[PDB]
Ligand binder design. Structure first.
Ligand SMILES: O=S(=O)(O)O[C@@H]1[C@H](O)[C@@H](O)[C@H](O[C@@H]2[C@@H]3OC[C@H]2O[C@H](O)[C@@H]3O)O[C@@H]1CO
Ligand SMILES: O=S(=O)(O)O[C@@H]1[C@H](O)[C@@H](O)[C@H](O[C@@H]2[C@@H]3OC[C@H]2O[C@H](O)[C@@H]3O)O[C@@H]1CO
Ligand SMILES: O=S(=O)(O)O[C@@H]1[C@H](O)[C@@H](O)[C@H](O[C@@H]2[C@@H]3OC[C@H]2O[C@H](O)[C@@H]3O)O[C@@H]1CO
Ligand SMILES: O=S(=O)(O)O[C@@H]1[C@H](O)[C@@H](O)[C@H](O[C@@H]2[C@@H]3OC[C@H]2O[C@H](O)[C@@H]3O)O[C@@H]1CO
Ligand SMILES: [Ca+2]
Ligand SMILES: [Ca+2]
Ligand SMILES: [Ca+2]
Ligand SMILES: [Ca+2]
Ligand SMILES: [Ca+2]
Ligand SMILES: [Ca+2]
Ligand SMILES: [Ca+2]
Ligand SMILES: [Ca+2]
Ligand SMILES: [Ca+2]
Ligand SMILES: [Ca+2]
Ligand SMILES: [Ca+2]
Ligand SMILES: [Ca+2]
Ligand SMILES: [Ca+2]
Ligand SMILES: [Ca+2]
Lengths: 472, 472, 472, 472
């Protein structure tokens, strides 16, 4: 029974790290990437926390667990992942692992503790269950101030980017690191196998860091991508609507967007420091050499691509792609360019730990890819499936199928679907849904989507077959 | 088997008519009110079309029929009322009624015809089923024009109020009347009992009429109510959000709101003319003397009360109250001040027509009240129940319980409930939810709400018992 | 809030009493019949304990409560009525009744107590929930002895009829009476309204009584009915199979069947004594003059009609008909010949006691009939609906519709349905299902059955529409 | 896309063949066993046709497909496998296989044809769907004749064993072979990949063969096993009851049981001839060298072990074990002694044929075992899971877990479970369930069963946790 450590981050993009030729020097994450298996084409299940984390920890899609929206936020109907869904936490406990959890959970008050973990520290540790959804009255008021031409301290906009007072040592991130260190120190003194999860709120917006991280990337030198700040042409209406109050970006100057980037980059630099602190502790405690590690982001984050901020009900690569490194100390490092999914994390843990199966596995173990490289998937279609059933109480039913060359997005709450040619239009600027030159590609993607919905027993296949009847 | 005629209107308020001391002379509706049973405290089930109409025609709440949102609109998940829900239409057909339908249906393409009616004319008559939701790209563009300081013809704002070209004879309303006349003429030549439904889109916004109705009420002379144009204090966040694009009323001048009223009043005057035309035809065809008539609005309409336009996920009296007249030619006219519900229409039709029962009746027959007056309900609590599960793809789960003196609104997708003292604050300006002086009233209303949710087997009772635990 | 007493008996036939011109002098029950409302055409919902009692106490059919088989018996899948089904017991407790229960419950261990009653005494009072089904190894062994030509003490067959040692004072029946007396004496000392249920295992087989009841009816003088001991002609196979081990009656002589009658009659004589003891106690305690009383049998019992013993999956009148007397001290006594149902008991209690509604009422209040006589139902079809979904782990799906003149039984687990002309063949000897002279009656009964299944939302309507396609 | 032939037999035991050292010379089946992969410890999913065949063809357990009883038989509630369950038949058709079906289907009228196969010949081919259950009036009458001391032609008992008139050429088996030959001859003329299923009613009882098979095995020379004709000691009551009318074996002499063996052996001899005819046709048509073959029995058959005949709700090896040979022409022959399951057939077909996944796979592909031998399962628990939810309308909920050394049977409709030490008591004579010497084994098997029920999402896990509370 191997020791396992998961380092989970909130809205951490695939592309920022120096090992991906990104703009932030991340030597600790780069070292882990170089020692482990790089999943460079990893895709989340949903660009939203609770659905992505339920999928990650249960290995099933939201229509199977019922966890298909964020919990505890205006105006979601959901409060918690059912206690019948024990997840990898309870499964590991059942075969004698000591499981520990630190930080962001967002699957219901006390959840890790109710499933047998030591919930050492985090927002949800001492909360009562069935609480009222958090309703963003303060964010609403502050975005109205931004629209009225007000700014916060030092001309910042604290619903978007913020200099935190103090130092790294004062941060939530440092507290989570300190609890992670305690978790590792305690594990080293136990005869029981260890499964530890350290889950950081960073780099979730508003993009916030203390000095020196707040000023380490000059906003004036940020390279903005080809899809930055464009008017969306022939995109679905759900990309227009102000779902969360900060999604009104009408007041954002180019300077504001550049600062959103420079603060995000500072947050990634601070995350790199946090990862180094935990890896150094694992080494000092004699756990590192045999430690099976996953580093993953729950989804990405929009920094003004398509004039969007944060996240919402859509399928753009900046949100859909996630960073993923899986380090198995028994394997030679490899780079995997086959697409993989958040649904593949639970089966990988299941194979590592010989977890009992508690039900379906909607994904596949990544061990074959970690052992053999891309050739493990010889003869298989290179696809990923993404869902966006709900955004905080709004129903969308979104499904996307992504190949290396194309993406098809079904928006069943709209009349407008999306079709992107990722080979010629990797920035997803041009919706080709109405372009007859793409009839063969759309037909193929519709067939692949129907097959996936059938495989996972998604009840929206009935509606899909109506909407796409011309292509079946 | 009596002949039955339903005259159904879309967003027709309880209060406009001259028989209710309202500002519009409505002699044809007044005459029907004076000949029939006035339900002066009638309440809709939901301030939204498809849920209210499914409840009206099936006699069950949306959680039982599955019809708990509008159909066919961005971003609802629903397309049609299940064909397993035959409604009063199929039930009447099954015992030998000739059923006819004209006008607005909004329960799925071809629905009345699929349930055995002659669907003589209307939007949904020749539409394919399972169509894509109508997504309001044009309304979105036009509201952006209004926010940019543009206006339409003659300085109007055609997403709010509009002079139609031509005359009454050119209108959808006149076409629906003409088909209603044909329906009555045909019924008079048949030996079979008749059940006819004429369902008008009027007075649904934008508030539109031709001359002379467009100019018959001077906007300068409109009396605006105490809750007109106020800033909402301590109200739920769902009252703030721009659900449909025209809900952005930030560009509306007092003149614009006054014109919304004067065009609405013109629409009610035109409806009165339409009702007269159908009643005169019933008289000319020898059907009127034995004709059992229902005149009802599916819900009201907001004309700037609480600075709200049209409708949305809320429970204010201007939307929740509905006009209702039920004329049984065998009964002396009476005014009923006991509250009644949209759920009471199907059981009243069931008693009139001896319809077979196809399942639960969530309401009660109104015949006892029509026969005896208010004393029929001696010893019963005077309550009404209102739901707002969904608004066009947004989930809210709203429940309201209303007594003559108080209203309690549960907003389970928010942290803020509502409590109104209708005796001291009939305009519902002051939310008393946090006022300890109302602890007894809130406790009583919470107990009444729990009992109603139990009675109708609403699965949200579990969440209710958590949210309201302090008062149970 | 009136005081209510229910006297419930297990397998007590409609016809044994002297007030029904039956063979047993029952002066106490006759007196109650003469003082109350006689429902002389009452019908149980199912000829099996747990389903009948769940229907009685909840007012909903088994497909709605899930309680569609006996609990706790080989080889039923069921253990208890869900605690979400509070029944009239919890509903009465909720409005301030003191509810007390004595004797047979058979709806799950501790059930009356878990729903707020004082469970004073009875088999289920101190039992653990979720116990293993009682499997009749002893009965199996003893019926094998009977088939081998053995007899029990005094030549009796103790799986069919038995002389108990001692006297009435030593019996379970006397203990249940004594607890009933305590219940009434305690109720007389309280100002709180009283709801008491005394539920007797008598006269459930084996038919067992002490002297002098054991020898009170001479077996040689028993009048056997026209359908006694016949070979079943063209009847469904479920009437042939040995479901419970004592259903093998191949070893029964005519003397054994006569003695099963003698002992059944002795048990009815002892029941009449028990009823007298409780009514006399109510009189002595000053409760009788205002006491609202129901006396009912859960179903009948087969004494060799169609060569059947006890009960099983079938719909014969001797099992389907039930005794019912409802005494409302405010009403003149009347005889009701309209059919009524076990589903009508909960709504009658709900009207008497002003119980809150916890859901559907599949039956109707009997107060209108108790007040007006048969004319209350002028213009209603005189039908009863009977179900036999399960017998102790065997699935049958049986439905029967009964009119004063005809009975149609659907046996969906068989190829043979039943059709009886009760006018010309009240003993139900001749199955007319294939007789084209009865095509009009069968068609009418099929239509009535389809209507009833639709009304109660019985999911077997789909299969019914296949099986009866020729008749719809 | 390889060509696939399935040879399926009805109630064919694992042990009769000469390759298993059994009493019948079966050179054709032995040759296939010697050329292919022998699964000598194969286990069916249920000892009943429709459930076993639904599991075989869908790769999911009955609680997932709803196909958990025989269809079309007194007194099952079921008529057909849902057409939403396309099975391997529709999945193979979807990727361009020509699928053909001959013989016994027993999953609903027309089922193979409705799923895209050429249903060449068989009982279900031209039948109407939703027919009334076959009710065994003839068998009931004839078993009554046997109990009255009558015999059939030549002193036979035709509900148990029967000489057919004519020769092999006149048999149903020869017709099924002849259609199988046509299927192979037609497949040889197509370039399209072939998937053929030939499903024989033999050797289902009554055990029936023409000469010379009827007299080939001398009944006087039959070797009877150690568990033949014993009185069952401390066994569950469902083993005693006469579920199907021929289960009354009280009239069977030792000669009658010996002849049931003689005729069963004659039927296996005739099956070996049938298999030879199809394999020889495959060779003559040039298909054999690349033909991927499965030969399997749906379950075994009881020949008087524990004094049982045919099958019923129980888990004895003679019924639970099944013959299985899988021949992949690309692989070296191997004998597999690891247990395998009927749930492993669909995934094996899915791997051979690259079938799309239509949902869960409750089993595993057998290719790794076929390639590597038993070592493929190194470090896996050697278990099999068996269910007996229903027998022809009787509910039993039975679950069995089997290891090489032990078997635990949960009988939730009884108070008696079973525990067999297969090492010391391979004939399953001694129920050890109450033997404290076996507490460790029972505890381990209970844990393994709980894990399996959780893995397949069997809703009976809730009741299992109550019944087995002492052991969890
Ligand atoms: O596999 S595990 O994660 O160890 O958990 C299994 C099973 O998957 C899980 O559903 C169950 O959870 C039970 C279930 O819901 C909540 C919890 O207790 C309740 O009473 C229900 O039995 O726990 C099992 C392992 O115990
Ligand atoms: O009561 S009615 O309105 O006359 O309709 C009843 C019943 O309520 C309704 O559910 C049923 O509808 C059937 C059902 O769904 C659609 C329609 O056909 C399908 O095949 C199903 O049988 O119709 C009955 C009366 O026929
Ligand atoms: O109407 S009552 O008989 O008073 O009971 C109601 C309701 O009908 C009943 O379902 C509920 O039972 C709750 C329910 O299951 C058991 C009990 O507690 C659980 O937690 C569930 O909420 O009790 C109410 C009265 O409170
Ligand atoms: O995978 S397949 O065997 O090819 O079948 C799939 C799917 O698994 C199956 O459920 C579906 O069956 C549809 C479904 O029920 C019957 C049939 O038509 C109905 O309208 C429903 O949509 O068929 C697909 C292949 O198309
Ligand atoms: Ca996130
Ligand atoms: Ca921080
Ligand atoms: Ca599944
Ligand atoms: Ca599927
Ligand atoms: Ca409306
Ligand atoms: Ca109009
Ligand atoms: Ca209901
Ligand atoms: Ca309820
Ligand atoms: Ca009984
Ligand atoms: Ca007794
Ligand atoms: Ca119904
Ligand atoms: Ca079989
Ligand atoms: Ca044959
Ligand atoms: Ca599970």
């Amino acid at each position: 029974k191997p020791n396992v450590l998961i380092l989970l981050f909130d809205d951490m993009r695939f592309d920022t790290f120096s090992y991906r030729n990104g703009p932030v020097s991340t030597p600790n994450i780069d070292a882990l990437a170089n020692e482990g298996t790089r999943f460079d084409q990893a895709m989340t299940s949903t660009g939203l926390a609770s659905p992505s984390r339920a999928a990650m920890f249960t290995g099933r899609w939201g229509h199977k667990t019922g966890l298909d929206d964020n919990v505890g936020l205006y105006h979601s109907r959901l409060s918690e992942l059912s206690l019948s869904e024990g997840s990898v936490i309870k499964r590991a406990t059942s075969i004698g692992y000591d499981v520990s959890y630190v930080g962001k959970w967002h699957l219901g008050a006390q959840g890790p503790a109710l499933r047998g973990a030591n919930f050492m520290w985090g927002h949800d540790k001492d909360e009562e269950r069935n609480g009222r959804p958090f309703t963003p009255y303060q964010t609403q008021k502050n975005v109205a101030r931004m629209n009225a031409g007000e700014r916060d301290k030092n001309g910042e906009k604290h619903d978007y980017y913020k200099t935190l007072p103090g130092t790294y040592a004062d941060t939530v991130t440092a507290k989570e690191v300190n609890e992670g260190k305690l978790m590792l120190q305690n594990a080293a003194k136990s005869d029981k196998p260890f499964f530890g999860i350290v889950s950081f709120e960073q780099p979730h917006p508003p993009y916030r860091v203390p000095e020196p991280y707040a000023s380490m990337y000059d906003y004036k030198d940020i390279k903005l991508p080809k899809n930055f700040g464009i008017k969306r042409k022939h995109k679905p209406m759900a990309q227009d609507d102000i779902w969360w109050p900060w999604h009104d970006v009408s007041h954002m100057s180019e300077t504001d967007w550049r600062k959103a980037h420079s603060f995000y980059y500072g947050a990634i630099a601070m995350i790199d420091h946090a990862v180094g602190e935990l890896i150094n502790t694992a080494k000092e405690e004699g756990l590192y050499d045999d430690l099976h590690i996953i580093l993953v982001g729950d989804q990405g984050s929009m920094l003004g691509e398509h004039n969007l901020y944060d996240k919402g009900p859509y399928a753009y690569d900046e949100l859909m792609r996630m960073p993923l490194i899986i380090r198995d100390p028994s394997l030679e490092p490899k780079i995997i360019n086959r697409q993989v999914s958040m649904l593949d994390i639970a089966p990988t843990l299941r194979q590592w730990m010989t977890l009992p199966l508690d039900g379906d596995e909607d994904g596949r173990s990544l061990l074959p890819l970690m052992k053999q490289g891309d050739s493990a998937d010889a003869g298989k279609d290179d696809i990923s499936l993404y869902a966006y059933e709900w955004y905080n109480g709004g129903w969308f039913g979104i499904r996307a199928i992504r190949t290396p060359e194309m993406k098809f997005v079904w928006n069943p709450g709209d009349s407008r679907d999306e079709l992107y040619d990722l080979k010629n239009d990797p920035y997803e600027i041009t919706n080709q849904i109405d372009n007859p030159k793409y009839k063969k590609q759309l037909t193929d993607l519709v067939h692949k989507m129907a097959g996936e919905l059938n495989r996972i027993d998604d009840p929206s296949l009935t509606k899909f077959n109506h909407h796409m009847k011309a292509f079946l």
